[PDB]
Amino acid sequence: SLRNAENEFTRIQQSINLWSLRLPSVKSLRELMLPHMRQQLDELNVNDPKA
Amino acid sequence: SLRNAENEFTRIQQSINLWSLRLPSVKSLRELMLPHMRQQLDELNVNDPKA
Amino acid sequence: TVLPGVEAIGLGYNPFISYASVNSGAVQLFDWATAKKREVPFKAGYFVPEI
Amino acid sequence: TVLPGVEAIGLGYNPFISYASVNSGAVQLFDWATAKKREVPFKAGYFVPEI
Amino acid sequence: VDSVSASPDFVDFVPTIPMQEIWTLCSSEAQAEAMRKHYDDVWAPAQSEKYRVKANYIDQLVVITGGSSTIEPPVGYSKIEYDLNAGAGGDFIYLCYHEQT
Amino acid sequence: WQADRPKDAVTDIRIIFNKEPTPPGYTKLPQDLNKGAGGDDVFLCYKTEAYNTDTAINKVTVIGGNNADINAPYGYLKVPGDLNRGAGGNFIYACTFVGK
Ligand SMILES: [Mg+2]
Numbered sequence: 531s532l533r534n535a536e537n538e539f540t541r542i543q544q545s546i547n548l549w550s551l552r553l554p555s556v557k558s559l560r561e562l563m564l565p566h567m568r569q570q571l572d573e574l575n576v577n578d579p580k581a
Numbered sequence: 582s583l584r585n586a587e588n589e590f591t592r593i594q595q596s597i598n599l600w601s602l603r604l605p606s607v608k609s610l611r612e613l614m615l616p617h618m619r620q621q622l623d624e625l626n627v628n629d630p631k632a
Numbered sequence: 633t634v635l636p637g638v639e640a641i642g643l644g645y646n647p648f649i650s651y652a653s654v655n656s657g658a659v660q661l662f663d664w665a666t667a668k669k670r671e672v673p674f675k676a677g678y679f680v681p682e683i
Numbered sequence: 684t685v686l687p688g689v690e691a692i693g694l695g696y697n698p699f700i701s702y703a704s705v706n707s708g709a710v711q712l713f714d715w716a717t718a719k720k721r722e723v724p725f726k727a728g729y730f731v732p733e734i
Numbered sequence: 735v736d737s738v739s740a741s742p743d744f745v746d747f748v749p750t751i752p753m754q755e756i757w758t759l760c761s762s763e764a765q766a767e768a769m770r771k772h773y774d775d776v777w778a779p780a781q782s783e784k785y786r787v788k789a790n791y792i793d794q795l796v797v798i799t800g801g802s803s804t805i806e807p808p809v810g811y812s813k814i815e816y817d818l819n820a821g822a823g824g825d826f827i828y829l830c831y832h833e834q835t
Numbered sequence: 836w837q838a839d840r841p842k843d844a845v846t847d848i849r850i851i852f853n854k855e856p857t858p859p860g861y862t863k864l865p866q867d868l869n870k871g872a873g874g875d876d877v878f879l880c881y882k883t884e885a886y887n888t889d890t891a892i893n894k895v896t897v898i899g900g901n902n903a904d905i906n907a908p909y910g911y912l913k914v915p916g917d918l919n920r921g922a923g924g925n926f927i928y929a930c931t932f933v934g935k
Contacts, residue, residue: 549635549637549672549674549675551635551637551638551640551641551680553641553642553683554683556683558683559662559683562662562663562664562667562681562683563661563662563663564660564661564662564663565663567659567661
């Protein structure tokens with residue numbers, strides 16, 4: 531009788547990083563938002579939770 | 582019976598240094614800060630710890 | 633030219649669906665095609681919104 | 684040209700999250716795109732804020 | 735790698751300020767509080783439930799009475815190893831389970 | 836398959852015995868499945884329907900063994916009445932499966 535077994539596994543990870551973008555969360559940021567998005571936000575009838 | 586074992590380890594560190602930047606912490610430095618950041622700082626309602 | 637990634641920041645986002653990917657999160661909220669643009673100091677010829 | 688790293692100094696920073704990296708710390712506070720610039724004496728053609 | 739230098743994609747957060755709540759962008763504190771309250775009380779619970787791992791679980795138990803080590807449970811069931819009379823007399827009785835995939 | 840104008844003889848099945856008459860609509864098979872086994876005479880019958888992909892019996896099988904009640908496979912239903920009712924040997928039961 532003969533029994534012969536092999537197992538093999540590899541894992542590789544590679545990562546590259548390049549520049550990060552940050553946004554300061556100042557109050558004037560609302561003025562930079564797209565107008566159709568802005569009116570969509572402030573037309574939200576928050577009296578309806580489903581909305 | 583035969584038993585045969587190997588262990589190997591390497592650690593390398595390489596470092597390069599280039600010029601350091603220093604900022605003098607003079608009081609006039611506040612005048613160089615970005616205006617939206619400045620007003621965000623001084624609009625802080627420090628009466629609220631959560632803010 | 634715009635700096636790559638300026639289209640991805642400000643993207644409306646859902647944190648529960650998946651880890652950091654443009655496929656979690658809906659639509660760009662900000663008009664940064666139109667905002668005032670600054671050149672990025674470490675890459676000549678690439679611009680971002682001043683914010 | 685700006686000296687590399689002048690975008691990183693003055694970055695608002697959190698000391699607890701991690702050791703020295705641009706990924707600890709939020710957003711640049713200072714308008715150094717606009718401040719008065721001095722040429723750095725040991726690298727011709729590179730400039731920094733006079734401060 | 736050359737293409738990554740020309741066209742990197744969003745891969746990871748800046749861990750200090752990764753994202754801002756949308757109601758920070760709101761016009762009004764009443765709306766913003768209503769959005770926050772609904773987010774806190776309703777939507778974030780639902781979404782965290784929606785994406786909670788729906789792990790595998792037992793569908794049913796049945797019992798098999800083959801009386802020996804040779805027995806195999808009904809089709810699709812899996813038997814537990816110890817018989818419920820180990821070291822006793824009588825028949826070897828085995829509990830077996832179906833798991834809902 | 837559900838070819839056009841599909842058909843189905845087997846919405847449900849029942850085991851019928853002692854040579855009692857079936858209610859109508861159940862087609863009854865003629866052979867005694869205990870012939871020479873002794874016991875009661877036992878027969879099988881099934882009811883025809885239109886197909887609907889979820890009432891129609893998708894699979895059918897038989898179970899049996901030493902135990903008087905024996906467990907059907909997962910999702911199968913055993914049919915009441917022993918297919919060796921009063922006869923020798925193992926208890927035996929038909930089993931039916933439906934997709935939901
Ligand atoms: Mg026991």
